[PDB]
Structures are given as C-alpha cells and as structure tokens.
Coordinates of C-alpha atoms and ligand atoms in Angstrom, one line a residue:
Chain P
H1 CA 0.0 0.0 -0.2
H2 CA 2.5 2.3 0.5
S3 CA 2.0 4.0 3.8
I4 CA 5.1 1.6 5.4
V5 CA 8.1 1.0 3.5
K6 CA 10.0 -1.3 5.0
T7 CA 13.9 0.3 4.7
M8 CA 17.5 -1.1 5.1
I9 CA 20.5 1.6 4.8
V10 CA 23.1 -0.1 3.7
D11 CA 26.7 2.3 3.7
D12 CA 30.0 1.3 5.4
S13 CA 30.2 4.7 7.0
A14 CA 28.2 4.9 9.9
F15 CA 28.0 8.7 9.7
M16 CA 26.2 8.6 6.5
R17 CA 23.9 5.2 8.0
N18 CA 22.8 7.6 10.6
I19 CA 22.2 10.4 7.9
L20 CA 19.9 8.6 6.3
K21 CA 18.3 7.7 9.1
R22 CA 17.5 11.0 10.7
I23 CA 16.2 12.2 7.4
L24 CA 13.6 8.2 6.9
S25 CA 13.0 9.4 10.8
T26 CA 10.6 12.8 10.2
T27 CA 8.8 10.3 7.7
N28 CA 6.6 8.9 8.3
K29 CA 6.5 6.4 5.7
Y30 CA 10.0 4.5 6.3
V31 CA 10.6 2.5 8.5
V32 CA 14.8 1.4 8.6
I33 CA 14.4 -2.3 9.7
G34 CA 18.5 -3.0 9.1
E35 CA 21.4 -1.9 8.8
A36 CA 24.4 -3.2 7.4
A37 CA 27.9 -1.9 6.9
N38 CA 29.4 -4.2 3.8
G39 CA 28.3 -5.8 0.7
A40 CA 27.9 -9.6 2.1
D41 CA 25.8 -8.1 4.6
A42 CA 23.4 -6.6 2.5
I43 CA 23.0 -9.6 0.8
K44 CA 21.9 -11.6 3.7
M45 CA 20.0 -9.0 5.5
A46 CA 17.8 -8.6 1.7
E47 CA 18.1 -11.7 1.9
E48 CA 17.0 -13.2 6.1
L49 CA 14.6 -10.0 6.2
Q50 CA 13.9 -8.8 3.2
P51 CA 13.2 -5.0 3.1
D52 CA 10.6 -3.3 0.4
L53 CA 13.6 -0.7 0.3
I54 CA 17.3 -0.7 0.6
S55 CA 19.0 2.1 0.2
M56 CA 22.9 1.0 -1.3
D57 CA 26.4 2.1 -1.4
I58 CA 28.6 1.4 -3.6
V59 CA 32.0 1.7 -2.0
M60 CA 32.1 -0.4 0.7
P61 CA 34.6 -3.2 2.3
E62 CA 33.8 -6.9 1.5
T63 CA 31.2 -6.6 -1.5
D64 CA 30.6 -3.3 -3.3
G65 CA 26.9 -2.0 -3.9
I66 CA 26.4 -2.8 -7.8
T67 CA 27.7 -6.7 -6.5
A68 CA 25.1 -7.3 -3.9
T69 CA 22.7 -4.9 -5.7
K70 CA 22.4 -7.6 -8.5
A71 CA 22.6 -10.2 -6.1
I72 CA 20.0 -8.8 -4.4
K73 CA 18.1 -9.0 -7.1
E74 CA 18.6 -11.6 -8.5
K75 CA 16.6 -13.8 -5.5
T76 CA 14.5 -10.9 -4.7
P77 CA 13.8 -8.9 -8.6
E78 CA 10.8 -7.8 -5.8
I79 CA 12.7 -4.8 -3.3
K80 CA 13.7 -1.6 -5.1
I81 CA 17.6 -0.5 -5.2
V82 CA 18.1 3.1 -4.5
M83 CA 22.2 3.5 -4.6
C84 CA 23.3 5.7 -2.6
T85 CA 27.1 6.7 -3.3
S86 CA 29.6 9.3 -3.4
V87 CA 31.2 7.8 -7.0
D88 CA 29.9 10.5 -9.7
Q89 CA 31.0 8.6 -12.7
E90 CA 28.6 7.7 -15.0
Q91 CA 30.4 3.5 -16.2
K92 CA 29.4 2.7 -12.3
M93 CA 26.4 4.4 -12.7
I94 CA 25.2 1.9 -15.8
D95 CA 26.5 -0.5 -13.8
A96 CA 24.3 -0.3 -11.0
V97 CA 21.0 0.3 -13.2
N98 CA 21.7 -2.7 -15.0
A99 CA 22.3 -5.0 -12.0
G100 CA 18.7 -3.4 -10.9
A101 CA 19.5 0.2 -9.0
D102 CA 16.4 1.2 -9.7
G103 CA 17.5 4.7 -7.8
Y104 CA 20.7 6.6 -7.8
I105 CA 21.4 9.4 -5.3
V106 CA 25.0 11.3 -5.3
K107 CA 26.9 12.3 -2.6
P108 CA 26.7 15.1 -1.0
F109 CA 22.1 14.8 -1.6
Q110 CA 20.3 17.2 0.3
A111 CA 17.3 15.4 2.1
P112 CA 14.6 15.9 0.3
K113 CA 16.1 15.3 -2.5
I114 CA 16.2 11.7 -2.0
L115 CA 12.3 11.4 -0.2
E116 CA 12.2 12.7 -3.5
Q117 CA 13.6 9.8 -4.9
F118 CA 12.4 7.3 -2.5
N119 CA 8.7 8.8 -3.1
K120 CA 8.3 7.9 -6.5
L121 CA 9.0 4.0 -5.8
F122 CA 6.9 4.1 -3.1
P123 CA 3.9 6.8 -3.9
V124 CA 1.5 7.8 -2.0
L125 CA -1.8 6.1 -3.2
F126 CA -5.1 7.5 -3.2
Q127 CA -7.6 5.5 -3.7
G128 CA -10.3 7.6 -3.7
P129 CA -12.9 10.9 -0.7
Chain J
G1 CA -3.2 34.5 43.2
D2 CA -4.3 36.9 41.1
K3 CA -1.1 38.3 38.6
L4 CA -0.9 34.0 37.5
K5 CA -5.3 33.9 37.0
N6 CA -5.1 37.0 35.2
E7 CA -1.7 35.6 33.1
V8 CA -3.3 32.9 32.2
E9 CA -6.3 34.1 31.3
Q10 CA -4.3 36.7 28.8
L11 CA -2.6 33.4 27.8
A12 CA -3.6 33.6 24.4
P13 CA -4.1 29.3 22.7
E14 CA -0.8 29.5 21.2
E15 CA 0.8 30.3 23.9
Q16 CA -1.6 27.9 25.6
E17 CA -0.7 25.6 23.7
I18 CA 3.5 26.2 22.7
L19 CA 3.5 25.7 27.3
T20 CA 2.1 22.8 27.1
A21 CA 4.2 21.5 24.4
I22 CA 7.7 21.9 26.1
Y23 CA 5.9 20.3 29.3
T24 CA 5.5 17.0 26.8
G25 CA 9.3 17.3 26.1
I26 CA 9.3 18.3 23.2
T27 CA 12.2 20.6 22.3
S28 CA 11.9 25.1 21.8
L29 CA 13.2 24.3 17.8
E30 CA 10.8 21.7 16.9
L31 CA 7.9 24.4 18.2
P32 CA 7.2 26.5 14.2
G33 CA 7.0 23.0 12.4
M34 CA 4.3 21.5 14.5
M35 CA 1.7 25.3 14.7
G36 CA 2.3 26.1 10.9
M37 CA 4.4 29.2 12.5
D38 CA 7.0 31.1 11.8
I39 CA 10.0 30.6 12.9
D40 CA 11.2 33.5 13.8
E41 CA 6.8 34.6 14.5
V42 CA 7.6 31.7 18.1
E43 CA 10.6 33.0 18.9
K44 CA 8.8 36.2 20.0
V45 CA 6.9 34.6 21.8
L46 CA 9.4 32.6 23.6
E47 CA 10.5 35.7 24.4
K48 CA 7.3 37.2 25.2
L49 CA 6.9 33.6 27.8
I50 CA 11.1 34.3 29.3
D51 CA 10.0 38.0 29.9
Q52 CA 6.4 37.4 31.9
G53 CA 8.1 33.4 33.5
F54 CA 6.4 31.2 31.7
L55 CA 9.9 30.3 30.6
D56 CA 13.8 30.3 31.5
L57 CA 16.2 30.6 28.9
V58 CA 18.0 26.9 29.0
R59 CA 20.7 27.3 25.9
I60 CA 20.3 29.4 23.0
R61 CA 22.0 27.2 19.3
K62 CA 22.6 28.9 16.5
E63 CA 20.6 27.5 13.6
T64 CA 23.0 27.8 10.4
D65 CA 23.9 27.6 7.2
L66 CA 26.8 26.3 4.7
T67 CA 28.5 29.6 3.1
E68 CA 29.8 28.3 -1.1
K69 CA 33.2 27.5 0.7
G70 CA 31.3 25.3 2.7
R71 CA 29.5 23.5 0.3
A72 CA 32.4 23.2 -2.0
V73 CA 34.0 21.4 1.4
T74 CA 31.5 19.0 1.6
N75 CA 31.8 18.0 -2.4
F76 CA 35.0 17.5 -1.6
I77 CA 34.7 15.8 2.0
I78 CA 31.9 13.5 0.4
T79 CA 34.2 10.3 -0.1
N80 CA 35.0 10.3 4.1
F81 CA 31.3 9.4 3.8
Chain M
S1 CA 26.0 30.3 -8.4
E2 CA 29.2 28.3 -9.8
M3 CA 31.3 31.0 -9.9
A4 CA 32.2 29.5 -6.3
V5 CA 33.2 26.3 -7.3
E6 CA 35.3 27.5 -9.9
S7 CA 36.9 29.9 -7.3
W8 CA 36.8 27.2 -4.9
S9 CA 39.7 25.2 -6.9
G10 CA 41.6 22.0 -5.7
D11 CA 44.2 24.0 -4.7
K12 CA 42.4 26.3 -2.0
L13 CA 39.8 23.6 -0.6
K14 CA 43.1 21.6 0.6
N15 CA 44.3 23.6 3.0
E16 CA 41.2 24.4 4.7
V17 CA 39.6 20.5 4.5
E18 CA 43.0 19.1 5.9
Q19 CA 42.7 22.1 8.3
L20 CA 39.2 20.8 10.0
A21 CA 38.8 18.1 12.5
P22 CA 36.6 14.7 11.1
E23 CA 33.6 15.5 13.2
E24 CA 33.9 19.1 11.7
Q25 CA 33.5 17.4 8.7
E26 CA 30.5 15.3 9.7
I27 CA 28.8 19.1 11.2
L28 CA 28.5 20.0 7.1
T29 CA 27.8 17.3 5.3
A30 CA 25.0 16.7 7.6
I31 CA 23.8 20.9 7.2
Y32 CA 24.6 19.8 3.9
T33 CA 21.6 17.2 3.7
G34 CA 18.9 19.3 5.7
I35 CA 20.1 18.1 8.7
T36 CA 18.9 21.3 10.7
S37 CA 21.7 23.0 13.6
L38 CA 19.2 22.1 15.9
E39 CA 19.5 18.9 15.2
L40 CA 23.5 16.8 15.3
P41 CA 24.1 16.8 19.3
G42 CA 21.1 13.6 19.1
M43 CA 22.5 12.2 16.1
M44 CA 26.7 12.3 17.0
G45 CA 26.8 11.6 20.7
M46 CA 28.1 15.0 21.1
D47 CA 27.1 17.1 23.9
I48 CA 25.0 20.4 23.1
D49 CA 27.4 22.4 24.1
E50 CA 30.2 21.2 22.5
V51 CA 28.5 21.7 19.2
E52 CA 27.5 24.8 19.6
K53 CA 31.5 25.5 20.2
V54 CA 32.0 24.1 16.8
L55 CA 29.6 25.9 14.7
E56 CA 30.6 29.1 16.2
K57 CA 33.9 27.9 15.2
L58 CA 33.0 27.7 11.9
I59 CA 31.6 30.6 11.5
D60 CA 34.1 31.9 12.3
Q61 CA 36.2 29.6 9.5
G62 CA 34.0 30.9 7.2
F63 CA 32.0 27.4 6.4
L64 CA 28.7 28.9 7.4
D65 CA 26.6 31.6 8.5
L66 CA 23.8 32.5 10.7
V67 CA 20.6 32.1 9.8
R68 CA 18.8 32.6 13.1
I69 CA 18.8 32.4 16.7
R70 CA 16.7 29.4 18.5
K71 CA 15.9 29.6 21.8
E72 CA 15.9 26.5 24.0
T73 CA 13.8 27.1 26.6
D74 CA 12.1 24.5 29.8
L75 CA 9.2 25.2 31.6
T76 CA 9.4 27.9 35.0
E77 CA 7.3 25.6 37.7
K78 CA 5.3 28.3 36.8
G79 CA 5.0 27.1 34.1
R80 CA 5.5 23.3 34.8
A81 CA 2.1 25.2 37.1
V82 CA 0.1 26.9 33.7
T83 CA -0.4 23.4 32.3
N84 CA -1.3 21.6 34.0
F85 CA -4.2 24.5 34.6
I86 CA -5.1 24.5 30.7
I87 CA -4.2 20.5 29.9
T88 CA -8.4 20.9 30.2
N89 CA -7.8 22.9 27.3
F90 CA -6.1 20.0 25.2
Chain I
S1 CA 8.7 -3.9 14.7
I2 CA 7.2 -2.0 13.3
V3 CA 3.7 -0.2 14.9
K4 CA 0.3 0.4 12.9
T5 CA -0.6 3.1 15.1
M6 CA -4.2 4.9 15.2
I7 CA -4.4 8.6 17.5
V8 CA -7.8 9.4 18.8
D9 CA -8.0 12.9 20.1
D10 CA -9.7 15.8 20.5
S11 CA -8.0 18.6 20.9
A12 CA -6.0 18.6 16.6
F13 CA -2.4 19.8 19.0
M14 CA -2.4 16.9 20.6
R15 CA -2.6 14.5 17.9
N16 CA 0.0 16.9 16.3
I17 CA 2.2 16.2 20.2
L18 CA 1.1 12.5 19.9
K19 CA 2.3 12.2 15.9
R20 CA 5.3 14.1 16.8
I21 CA 6.7 12.4 19.8
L22 CA 6.0 9.1 17.7
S23 CA 8.1 10.5 14.7
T24 CA 11.1 9.6 16.7
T25 CA 10.1 6.5 16.9
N26 CA 11.7 3.3 14.0
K27 CA 8.4 1.8 15.5
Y28 CA 5.3 3.4 15.4
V29 CA 3.4 5.2 11.8
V30 CA 0.8 7.2 12.7
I31 CA -1.8 5.5 9.9
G32 CA -4.8 7.9 11.0
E33 CA -6.5 10.2 13.3
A34 CA -9.7 10.8 14.7
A35 CA -11.1 13.9 16.3
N36 CA -14.0 11.9 18.2
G37 CA -15.0 8.6 19.3
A38 CA -17.6 7.2 16.8
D39 CA -14.8 8.2 14.7
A40 CA -12.6 6.0 15.7
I41 CA -15.2 3.0 16.1
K42 CA -15.3 2.9 11.9
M43 CA -11.7 4.1 11.5
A44 CA -9.9 1.2 13.7
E45 CA -12.4 -0.8 12.0
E46 CA -11.5 1.4 8.5
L47 CA -7.0 0.5 9.9
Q48 CA -7.4 -2.5 11.3
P49 CA -4.1 -0.4 13.9
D50 CA -2.2 -2.0 16.2
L51 CA -2.1 0.5 19.0
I52 CA -4.7 3.6 19.2
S53 CA -4.2 6.9 21.4
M54 CA -7.0 6.8 23.4
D55 CA -8.7 10.5 24.3
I56 CA -12.2 9.2 27.1
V57 CA -13.5 13.1 26.7
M58 CA -14.6 14.1 23.4
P59 CA -17.6 15.7 21.3
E60 CA -19.5 13.0 19.7
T61 CA -18.8 9.3 21.4
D62 CA -16.2 9.4 24.8
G63 CA -13.6 7.6 24.6
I64 CA -14.8 4.9 27.1
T65 CA -17.8 4.2 24.7
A66 CA -15.7 3.5 21.5
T67 CA -12.5 1.8 23.8
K68 CA -15.5 -0.5 24.2
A69 CA -17.2 -1.0 21.0
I70 CA -13.5 -1.1 19.4
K71 CA -12.1 -3.9 21.6
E72 CA -15.4 -6.5 20.9
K73 CA -15.4 -5.7 17.9
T74 CA -11.7 -6.2 17.7
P75 CA -9.6 -7.2 20.9
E76 CA -6.3 -7.6 19.4
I77 CA -6.5 -4.3 18.4
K78 CA -3.7 -2.6 22.5
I79 CA -6.0 1.1 23.5
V80 CA -4.1 3.3 25.9
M81 CA -6.1 5.6 27.1
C82 CA -4.8 9.6 27.0
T83 CA -6.8 11.8 28.7
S84 CA -7.0 15.1 31.6
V85 CA -9.6 12.3 34.1
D86 CA -7.2 11.0 36.1
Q87 CA -10.6 10.2 38.1
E88 CA -10.4 6.1 39.6
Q89 CA -14.0 5.7 38.4
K90 CA -13.6 6.6 34.9
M91 CA -10.4 5.6 34.9
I92 CA -12.1 1.8 36.0
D93 CA -14.6 2.0 33.2
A94 CA -11.6 2.7 30.5
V95 CA -10.2 -0.4 32.2
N96 CA -13.3 -2.8 32.1
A97 CA -13.9 -1.5 28.5
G98 CA -11.0 -3.2 28.1
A99 CA -7.9 -0.2 27.6
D100 CA -4.9 -1.5 27.6
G101 CA -3.1 1.0 29.4
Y102 CA -4.0 4.6 30.5
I103 CA -1.9 8.1 30.1
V104 CA -2.6 10.9 32.3
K105 CA -1.7 14.5 30.1
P106 CA 0.6 16.3 31.1
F107 CA 2.3 13.8 30.4
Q108 CA 6.0 13.5 29.2
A109 CA 7.3 12.3 26.5
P110 CA 9.0 9.6 27.5
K111 CA 6.3 7.7 29.1
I112 CA 3.8 8.2 25.9
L113 CA 6.6 5.6 25.3
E114 CA 6.9 3.7 28.6
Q115 CA 3.0 2.2 27.8
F116 CA 3.4 2.1 24.5
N117 CA 6.7 -0.3 24.3
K118 CA 6.1 -1.6 27.3
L119 CA 3.1 -3.1 24.4
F120 CA 5.0 -3.3 21.8
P121 CA 8.4 -5.1 22.8
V122 CA 11.8 -5.0 22.1
Ligands
BEF1 F1 30.9 4.2 -0.7 BE1 29.7 5.3 -0.6 F2 30.2 4.6 -2.5 F3 29.8 6.7 -0.8
BEF2 F1 -9.4 15.8 26.4 BE1 -9.5 15.3 28.1 F2 -8.2 14.6 27.7 F3 -10.1 14.0 28.2
MG3 MG1 31.6 4.0 1.4
MG4 MG1 -11.3 15.7 25.6

C-alpha cells in the first residue's frame, strides 16, 4: 500500500547511515528495519529481513554495492534498491542500473531530493474520497 | 494568586499550545513545524513567555547554513562518507 | 552561482579541508543534507554545548553563516503549573 | 517491529504532539487520526491498527465507549487511554472497557513511549 516502507540502509560509513536515518525518521512511512556495513552483510540481511527498499552505497568493504544490488535482485527482484553513493562516474552508474538499481543518488545530497527519490518508487496511493 | 489567573487568562491559545508542547518534552526548536508558524514569530512568543516567567532560557542555539565555501568543502570531503 | 565552485579550486580547498577536524567535517556533511544545526548533538554523540562551540568556529572559519538564533527554553515551575491548569483545553 | 498506530483526540494540537513524539521512533507509524469517538470506531475497523491513542472526553462519543466498541469488535487492537481525566472511576471504566494502558495528560514524552513500548516490546 506504500503507507509503510520497510527500509534497509547499506553504507560502510556509520555517519552516512545515521544521515539517512534522521531523514527517514521524520517521514511517516520509511521505517529503517536494518543496517549493513558491507555488501556481504547487505546481501544476507536483505535475504533475511526482506525489506521493501534498500539504500545502497557502492564503495564498501568485502563486497561492493553493485555486486550486492545484483545478487539481492536475482533472489529478490521485488526489493527496490536505490544506490546512495559518492561515485559520480557515469559508467559505474550504468553498471548499477544494469545490476537492478531502481534509483541513484549522488552524495552530497539534500534530504528532500532523496525522499523525492524514494517517493517515486513508493508513492502515496489514493483510492478516492 | 490574582496576578497568575489574569496572566493565564491573557495567555492566547498559541501560548497555551507552546507551554503544553515543552511540558511533553518537545524541544523549543521543532515547535514552528508543529504549529504551522514562522520560526521568527515563535521565537518572539518564546521571548514573551520568558519575560512573563512561563519559560526559562536554558540554552541559546544557532541555526546555520553552509557558505559556498562550506558546500565546496562538503563536495570535497564526501568520499570520507 | 557556479562561480563559487570554480573560485574554490582544488588547491585552495585542501588547505582549509585538511585543517578541518573529522567531527567538523561531519557537521558540514550533515548540514548540507538538510539536517538542521538544531539536530546534530542527538545525532553525533556530542553534548549540545560542544556542537555550539564547533558551530561558532565554523562561522569564524567561514564555512557557515548564522541564519537565525534559536532559544532552548524549559518550563518554570510557574509554567509547569499553568500547563497543568490549561491541560483541560486539550 | 512496526506498530500501526491510530491517534484519537478532539484536540488537534494534541494529536500533533502525539504524532511528533511517535515520529522520532522507528516503530510507530501514525496511520490515522480521529477527532471524536464515533469516527474512531469505524476508522479502527478501516485500518485495523495495532495501537490507538484514545482520549475519553470527546464531542460525539466518549473514549470509553469507543474503546469498548472497538475491543469486542476487534480485541487484538491494543488501546491506551491518553487524557486529562484522572478520576479513578473513569479510569476503572476504561480498564473494564478493555483498555490496555492509561496515560494521564499532561504527560512526558518518554512515558507515552513507556506504555506503548510496554505493549510492543523490543
Ligand atoms: F561509499 Be559510497 F559508494 F559513497
Ligand atoms: F481531552 Be481530555 F484529555 F479527555
Ligand atoms: Mg562507502
Ligand atoms: Mg478531549
């Protein structure tokens, strides 16, 4: 229904993960149900927690975010994954979209832009007055 | 006794709502978004209620915006995050 | 506009950026994203006065400007009693 | 843990206080707001919430009757009274109507969460 979006934040920077938590906390729909510090944990946690949405950094230990995006998507294609990374090279970005990424935000980002990003994948759905 | 009741009666709804908010624990900072009010107007009401003794100024905090220097530095340091 | 991006070329920036402490780099990245300067101490494990000291340096160091000044106010025992008197209004 | 939460109070500012407090939590999603009893019973049937913040004194239907109507229509809904009424008899009626918690306003924010977290623990 999109009134509640189980969200999973994947970034090796704890501070950046904390950034995305303040932003999503003020919203009435995005509930951070998990955090992964590396892509290998991102793969497993998405497997176990089945989030509706994953904010996915790219440059991370153990396994990158594009490899994580792809591996999560061939098990759970229903999961929406939005790359949240500082890599702005258009190639990596083509690679992310080809891996399954539904979104791509470049750090530094402004909070309304990433909610505007997230809200396209999970819009407010009106059934009528 | 008489001074307080005239004050309580002269306390407009906005001021009653503020006082109720701080009691619950709502910091004086996120009051404007809760009342649909300008941040500058709410701060003048706070200043009205400290002078009349309903509130005590605990701490003075600064709200800041990045300079173009700031945004340039953030753009540079971002790979650390 | 974009003039500032060019005016702050890489050579000048690194001197001030290397000056900046790791925490101070965190205030800026958070403030950029939109997290208010009222919102950091509860997010950075820092006491509210340390943040305010750091903010005032970044306004002195030139990285920040002072949009407005915010009051942290608590109820006096008068106001605590007033709230208990007007609670019926809510 | 996600708690679909419904806020029932005739005071708009008080539903606002209760929403702002539940916003900082990573648990409570306010999915509905009722300004009186009558609307709270049928909205509770609409949304099937996990938790309802229930005032008593309200224009059309009191919170006790609303609680009572919702409880043995939908007993799984945890109902917590949140109110300026401290008279023990009205309290007794709330608990006997089926209420699971009782908050007396004026309240502190950590205690709003303490009732709610007590009924949906971490
Ligand atoms: F480390 Be992330 F790709 F910004
Ligand atoms: F509005 Be009262 F707290 F019943
Ligand atoms: Mg990284
Ligand atoms: Mg009432």
